[PDB]
Paper text:
Human gamma-D crystallin (HGD) is a soluble, monomeric protein expressed in the eye lens during fetal development. The high expression levels contribute to the refractive index within the lens which focuses visible light upon the retina. However, this halts further expression of HGD. This means HGD must remain correctly folded and soluble for the entire human lifespan in order to maintain visual acuity. In order to observe structural changes in HGD, we take advantage of an arginine-to-serine point mutation, R36S, first identified in congenital cataracts (HGDm).
UV-lability of the Cys-DTT disulfide was tested by exposing similarly aged crystals to a UV LED at 285 nm during X-ray data collection. In the first 5 ms dataset, DTT adduct cleavage is visible at C41 and C108 in both chains, with oxidation to sulfenic acid observed at C41 in both chains. We show that UV exposure is then able to disrupt the disulfide bond, and partially restore the conformation to that of fresh crystallin. However, with continuous illumination we observe the formation of sulfenic acid at C41, cysteine at C108 and no obvious changes to the structure of the neighboring tryptophans W42 and W130 in both copies of HGDm in the asymmetric unit. No evidence of these modifications was observed in the electron density of the light structure nor was it possible to locate the liberated DTT. The analysis of atomic coordinate-derived conformational space (RoPE, described in Methods Section 4.6), show that while aging of the crystal produces a large shift in the conformational space, this is partially reversed by UV exposure. The corresponding interatomic distance plots also show a reversal of the conformational changes that occurred during aging for each chain. However, total reversal is precluded perhaps due to the rate of structural relaxation and oxidation of C41 to sulfenic acid, although a much smaller covalent modification, may continue to influence the conformation. In support of this, we have shown that after UV illumination of aged crystals, HGDm returns at least in part to the original conformational state of fresh protein. Hence, disulfide cleavage likely proceeds in the most part via tryptophan excitation.
Author numbering: 1 to 172
The structure:
Amino acid sequence: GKITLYEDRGFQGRHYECSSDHPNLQPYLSRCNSASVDSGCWMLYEQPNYSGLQYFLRRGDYADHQQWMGLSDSVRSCRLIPHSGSHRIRLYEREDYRGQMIEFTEDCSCLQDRFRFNEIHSLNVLEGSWVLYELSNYRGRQYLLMPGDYRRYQDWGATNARVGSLRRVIDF
């Protein structure tokens, strides 16, 4: 993968090129207002060392931070999300994989249309990387999910169990 981050809007200002995970952009970039993704799927992070608000970017050009749904121009670390050959996630009504369960292998823009629960209290990412969104149609707070067990919503870094949509991390 390759991403170019720019300090100012419309691909102007001081810039920095990443080919891999960077836990600390602070010495190189004082803010980020535009970005060009040549290749790979990237997660940008408000704070250093992959913490604070998260933003998913794919191949393409972002002329201002609003285009990746950024709330500010703070980008202090970034992750190249590894390629996955296949995608499967189980969502559960309750903590520790109890209650009603639904399994997805494809993107879902409205979770409540398939699974009549506003809150997801645990999930199992069996295959691939996903992005959980707080709201329907891929809006609100974003949480990157990599393969693993998530026995409660804190495990995916959320302050609540609100989930409205989710998407596979895929290029194409």
